[PDB]
Amino acid sequence: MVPGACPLILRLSPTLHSADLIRDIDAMRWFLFEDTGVPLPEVNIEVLPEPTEKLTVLLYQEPVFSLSIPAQADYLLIGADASVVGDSQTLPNGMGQICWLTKDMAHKAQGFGLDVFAGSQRISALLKCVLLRHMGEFIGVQETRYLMNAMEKNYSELVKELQRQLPINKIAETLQRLVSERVSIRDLRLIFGTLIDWAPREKDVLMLTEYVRIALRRHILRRLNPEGKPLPILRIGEGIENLVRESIRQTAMGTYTALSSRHKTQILQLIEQALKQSAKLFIVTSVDTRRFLRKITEATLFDVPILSWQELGEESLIQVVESIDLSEEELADNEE
Amino acid sequence: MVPGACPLILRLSPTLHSADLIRDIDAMRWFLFEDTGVPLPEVNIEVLPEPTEKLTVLLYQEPVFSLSIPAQADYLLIGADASVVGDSQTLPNGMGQICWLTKDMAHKAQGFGLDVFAGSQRISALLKCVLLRHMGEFIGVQETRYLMNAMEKNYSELVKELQRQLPINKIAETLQRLVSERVSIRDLRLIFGTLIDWAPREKDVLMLTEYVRIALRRHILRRLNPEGKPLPILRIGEGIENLVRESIRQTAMGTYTALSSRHKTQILQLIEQALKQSAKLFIVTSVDTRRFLRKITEATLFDVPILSWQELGEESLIQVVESIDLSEEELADNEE
Amino acid sequence: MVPGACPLILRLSPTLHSADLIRDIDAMRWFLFEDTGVPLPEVNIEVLPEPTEKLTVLLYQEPVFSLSIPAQADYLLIGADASVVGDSQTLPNGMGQICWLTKDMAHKAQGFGLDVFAGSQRISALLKCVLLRHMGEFIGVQETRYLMNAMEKNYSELVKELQRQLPINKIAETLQRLVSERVSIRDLRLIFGTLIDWAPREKDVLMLTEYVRIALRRHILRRLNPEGKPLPILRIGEGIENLVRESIRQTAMGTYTALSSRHKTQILQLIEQALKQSAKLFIVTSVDTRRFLRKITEATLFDVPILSWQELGEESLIQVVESIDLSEEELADNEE
Amino acid sequence: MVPGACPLILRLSPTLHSADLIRDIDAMRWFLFEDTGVPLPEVNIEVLPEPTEKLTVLLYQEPVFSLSIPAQADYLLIGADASVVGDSQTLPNGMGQICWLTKDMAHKAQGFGLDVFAGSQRISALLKCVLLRHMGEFIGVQETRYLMNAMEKNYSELVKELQRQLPINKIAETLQRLVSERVSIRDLRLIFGTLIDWAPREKDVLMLTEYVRIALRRHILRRLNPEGKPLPILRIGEGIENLVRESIRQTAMGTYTALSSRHKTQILQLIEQALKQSAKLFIVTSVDTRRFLRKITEATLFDVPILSWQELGEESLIQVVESIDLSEEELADNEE
Amino acid sequence: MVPGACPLILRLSPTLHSADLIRDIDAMRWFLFEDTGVPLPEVNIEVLPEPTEKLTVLLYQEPVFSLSIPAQADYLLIGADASVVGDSQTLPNGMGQICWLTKDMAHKAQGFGLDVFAGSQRISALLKCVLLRHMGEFIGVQETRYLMNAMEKNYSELVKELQRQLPINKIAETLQRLVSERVSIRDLRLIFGTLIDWAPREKDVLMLTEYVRIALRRHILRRLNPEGKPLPILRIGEGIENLVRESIRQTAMGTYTALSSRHKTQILQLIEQALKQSAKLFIVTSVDTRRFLRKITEATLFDVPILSWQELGEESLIQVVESIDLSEEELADNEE
Amino acid sequence: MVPGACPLILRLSPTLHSADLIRDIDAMRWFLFEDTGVPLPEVNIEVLPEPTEKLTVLLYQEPVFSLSIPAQADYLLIGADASVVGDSQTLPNGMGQICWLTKDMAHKAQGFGLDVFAGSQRISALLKCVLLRHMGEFIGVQETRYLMNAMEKNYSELVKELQRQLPINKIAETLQRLVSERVSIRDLRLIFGTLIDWAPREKDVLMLTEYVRIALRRHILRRLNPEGKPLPILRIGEGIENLVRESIRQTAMGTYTALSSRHKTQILQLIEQALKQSAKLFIVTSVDTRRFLRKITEATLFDVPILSWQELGEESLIQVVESIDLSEEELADNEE
């Protein structure tokens, strides 16, 4: 009877099991650590006797993924596009779309310039997708302590100064709030430097996270679009900025937002209305209204990146696509 | 899985690789340490398989430099001038201009009295340029602790007194603010002496940095122009000095500037307007308005040196070239 | 990569190097320590390949002296006078004048009753001049700690009491302020005794330095003129004394002066006007106005000694040469 | 790279794996520990992708068992008899015979009064057979130390006295020599008591093992035949006893046997000749000739128990079946 | 200047380098450790600028392998056979034969049932061959101490007892003598158990190695031929056994052989004469004459396995192919 | 007054001095350490005022090299050959020949396929020659302790075992005897392993050195001729081998040779007679007579390598050039 759930378990029917699965999963874990900076725990391979070809992914013994992989498809392609269509289905929890492709069509799709997985890879490129959705769950107080112990080797004084500044729960909260936005915490030297700079002058951990995000703006704007080409930007007009800026209520532990449910519902409804025009859009708002806006759109629109103006330096051109704007709702619509 | 990004990585196609590259890079690193006083971390040479002749420079695993060196050019000359023209291109991030010269023309340019690099040197004189742009990133709390440990050998009491005066984060902030202006921190005895003098009488780390810059004025005015010949100086008129002096707002952690965005935009626009007349200009303003002016021109005009009046002693003649002046903008233009 | 600049470096071209240079430099260093009490660091002899006969003196790797010694002169005489003229030039940074003399004329000048250097000495009598200009740079917190450790051998209780009175940064500030005026700190017993006496009753380190200077008045008035003969004295009239006495503004760290730039400029202009009548003049003012006057004339007139009335006891006759006097400038000239 | 082979690995193809395999293997391990007293190491279940239904058992990563279980058989019965025949094959390394029985015939065989395994049990009753053949390999110096540490809880003085008597390598040798004969070492109190009694009076570890076997005679004669019914006994005549008794050669480490290869070959040939008359026979010889006889018949006839006369007390009746006897061979046959 | 040569260096020319080389080499190292039990040191990849496609393998900075891989071949097959012929050459130091195969012929050879390497693998399957020739050089006193420290985790008492028995140089000698015969030391529990058993009763480290080889006979006869099929055996007749048995001369450190050079030369000449009839032959001799025979055939015939009679149990059938026999040479030929 | 001479001093006239001399000497020192394994002490550059272009090399302040480099030669080539002739002279102490070549002829010689030095290199390629003659003087007890301390990092148990075997003076004697024969001690792992193997079984440090030389035979026969081509070998006939083998006289500290001076004189005279036929010859004798022969030819013929038969394995073909043979001298010539 060992307290504490088993972190990451992958249950497979013995048909799906293989001999190179261990090294493929390890390579995927190393790629995920190099990309997002969170050191994932070992994946425990377990055998699930089932006549149907089915796999499950269990996080802390609560099953978060359950998919039954049809026998007809032997080639896997994550996501959908116009060039490739056929035998596609929706992943649960809004993880996206997957396509099972026949051999020749999959070879054509790979020639088209995309990634296509075959064999044990079809498991990794599935499992990895799940791990990219519940990522913020693998960074707590204990994982933060492990990261700080790892950094104590070459950076002893940096870690000692940081501990002298902030208690470990606040550092873990900052790292978790950074991970849950697809911001890599791979560069821990810069993160600890920014926390050391702004720890005496700030106590709201949300604002410390904002400062760390600003200090990491080059990385964010590199990861969002690897090429230098301009990608679409959806501005937020002054109406919404003033609406969310006026409702800021502060207590001894920091500032939060206090809006009517009607305001949030209308803002999300119109943002989803403005998001169906193009596949990818970066919502851009002011610095003082960015985080609050995020925490009214994180529950539903988790995979849309909410950037800020200061995070886009003068060296990035905008190319506005749409300009969302509103007036209030409870007092008078005036826009809606 | 080792936390903490790898500091400095140079990825090369195997054609560009060589046998004397290690010692050439080490010589460049030693020159950079003798010049700017920042001890750089070891450059990790990695091989990048690519049909095109390409190299990348990665700082903390975020690629900051990526250049594809054409096969036709075998002679490299950093910068541009009227005497030499041909096969020149712009370095990214505004690092400057480079010229690829044929053998005979490069020999003529070397005879002209300039530096021309051939072989592994063409890598160093590229890499070094990058390292001269992101220099302020190699000096943090940990590197400051390493410098203080190095100085504990001959200067034990100086370092002990300095630690008794200031905490290590403030010393690291001072050294970083000095490095990010192309002021060498090679002379650590004088820097620690000035911090020991002015630490009890000052708490704004920006002002401590100003005092350290003033105590280093001979070095600054030697490095800006190695010869004693007078170089052009662009004065700042009393209008801008009074504009930025009136907007000084102080909090418990020190004083900052608070100007309208229109004021900053017009000041930078006219400074760039006044900078195209001659290649090099030293902007000179008052002591109380120098640092603030710098922090409204650091984002765009990083490579222009913002000197002060006290940094130019009575032994340096001025030779004013232009006298910039303004009145306000929001209240009334009156100059603009 | 060793932090901390190399203190004192002498770079010489092939021909000027010699075999007795080491012992000549060591003898000069010992003479400078016996004269001014500051223990100088070892001079590092380095070879500078140059077709022209040139030497450089580098303090903390920032070149402070650079002279190209013509081949025609083989006899060196520091300073100028009416009896000897020919092949003379101005040393940089206003260190003085030098004369290169032919063998017979140099023998005649030596017979005249002056010092003439030949061989390796021509280097020392040059280097020493430089070391007599930047002397105050070889006395900091660390050198003060070395002096106190040296004095802990015979004077243990004196040093212990002094440490109990003043922190090491204030002692180093006092010693530096004494060295930067050509006042020897060779007599450390008396200096520590005066600091022990006046430390409880005073907190302005400038005033502690004034008291130490007064307690050393016999040494000062011996070193200024080794013979008992009366040398010229330039009094400061009551107008300037009252002008600088009225502007004394005190803060928690001590008192400073606050004068208009016009006042300082006119005072220095007239002092230089009054200094061209005779080669050497001792400016004499009151005790309460002495140090402040010094800190308005140190930047330009570094080599003129600013004595005080209490430093000249009743046993030294004055022989006034000129009596400078003024009224204010901004309110009304009335003298200027 | 972890030194030391993985102790016990069971590799199974997709279809043979199950969900209750873990608890079935654990129950088999507990039964084996309760029966033979050797604490087995954890069985590591690994998946072996193979179209054919195959399993392998690996001891220290050297595969000792490899069996391909035909799809037609779903009911397993270990061993063979006249009542049940059909679909039977020989296990490798002479482990015995197995029968794959159809459902109805297996139910009839179970009704007959035998054990029949179905499902995951068909793996255990296979694996267990292997573990009953290489048992003596799971008891070394380290496992002996683990047993003694377990006994230090209730029997601290017994273990302390035993350690004071014999070094751990001799205790491990005794336990190994007892395990490799199908004598349980479950009763460690009695074994340690007998080693404590006879350790001062004996140094030949083989003779200590003989004394421990004699002190355990009740257990041996209970385990060989659980019921009190008389089972067949094959006596060894005085000729063989005198032949092996005369050849006893002793060195400082104890006594061994030295026989001609012809003698051993003829003895084994006739014993196998006398063993085909009945399925089970207990070979019984004198005390002084028992162990030596065992070590000339252990290589080939491993599973036949070589009892002694003193191990069969006066309360066990004999019922001799055959009386083997010989004269020598090299000198003269006289019997063979 | 770091004493101690760099263990394993692989130098490759520009084009042979790749991106998956690191993981391919690591997989080869892990396979070599799982096979032969010797933990190899990290392979250092270095770039060797060379117009010709060449690689070198350096053991302790003494180049042991140097091969220039022709551009025409892109498919590699280690060894030679009748089914595949074309573009084959001899590896240096008698490592074997290699074949460079065109794509279609290599696919046909892979279909034939052999291993064919392409890409970075062509390096590994080369490097690995070298590592299988100088294997006995990666096991010394220090590597033995590392193995014993690794075994101290689960087997603490086994290692402690072994250290109490034998000093570390003798254990390292035993492990080295086992590795230099292609006997895996992966099973360290059994090796340490056999050394603990036979350490008190033996002092000749060669005989301890013989006992450890006998205790590992199942592993040896499994690795020599993975299948149970009978492979050819070349017996050694009684003449050679008696010749080498008579010449055994013992000193305080153990027994060695003392034969005339003519005897050794004739024995090797006839063994090579008897080895050209079939590709693989296992030379089998008596126990008392096995090791000595090995140490007269190790210098020339390194890759032929010299088994013994006791290492082949009664369960392995022989299938003699030839029966070598001789009389002496110096006294009288009588056979040669 | 510091006891202990200054190890390595290079005195140069200031014309020969340069700016890159420090790094050129450091590169030469690193090459010498990589080649011969002896860590050389820092070269102290001193200036020697001399009208003539002269340099001296001082080992422990006893001048071992003194050369006056003529002004006419500006290109240096070490050694002589038929292809290049002109302005050549003999180095002192039989270090060899040097050639000063004019620019065009030196370029032709470099094109011929040799090494030609210009500038500061002309000093290194001189100094290095000296360091290759008195090499055995830079390895004593203290340098051996430094090497063992360096090896204590990765090889702690190897060094500890070696210290337990041999005292440091014997290890230093072995390393010195290996260095004074141009055998590299770069591979310290193998040397310490061989000393650990043969330390219990041998006490004559000369024989331990012989065993270490035999274990290093591959390195010796690689360094003597880098290519695999056969180089000439001068055998020593059985007469000399029997002469020096009969005179072996042993005392408690080992065996030495005791020959008549006539025997040694005749052997050296004829060896020099046999050495003028070809430039390079490897003298090859038996194992039991090798070292003794070396210690009768080390005083005069220092640079000729005295190999052995066991050092040339069966894989190196001989190509005898001459076969020297003698009978005794004092009893009767019979050959001489």
Author numbering:
A (entry chain Q), B (entry chain R), C (entry chain J), D (entry chain B), E (entry chain A), F (entry chain E): 346 to 681
Question: What text appears in the publication on this structure?
Answer:
The inner membrane export gate protein, SctV (InvA in SPI-1 and SsaV in SPI-2), is the largest component of the injectisome and is essential for assembly and function of T3SS. SctV comprises a highly conserved N-terminal transmembrane (TM) domain and a less conserved C-terminal cytoplasmic domain (SctVC), which are connected via a ∼20–40 amino acid linker, SctVL, in most bacteria using the T3SS. It has been reported that SctV is one of the “engines” of T3SS; the TM domain forms a putative proton channel, and SctVC forms a nonameric ring connecting to SctN (ATPase) through SctO (the stalk protein) to function as the F0F1-ATPase, coupling energy from ATP hydrolysis and the proton-motive force to secrete unfolded bacterial effectors into the eukaryotic host. Consistent with other reported SctVC structures, the SsaVC monomer also has a four-subdomain (SD) structure and further assembles to a nonameric ring aligned to SD3, which is the most conserved region of SsaVC.
Unlike InvAC, SsaVC could maintain a very stable high oligomeric state even in the high salt concentration analyzed by the size exclusion chromatography (SEC) and dynamic light scattering (DLS). Through a cryo-EM single particle analysis approach, we reconstructed and classified two conformations of SsaVC: one 3.55 Å cryo-EM structure with double stacked nonameric rings with D9 symmetry, and the other 3.64 Å cryo-EM structure with a single nonameric ring with C9 symmetry, the particle number of which are approximately comparable. The double-layer ring conformation of SsaVC is considered to be an artifact, consistent with a previous study. Notably, most of the C9 single-layer ring of the SsaVC particles were calculated from top views, and most of the D9 double-layer ring of SsaVC particles came from side views. We speculate that this is because the top-view protein particles are more vulnerable to air–water interface damage than the side-view particles.
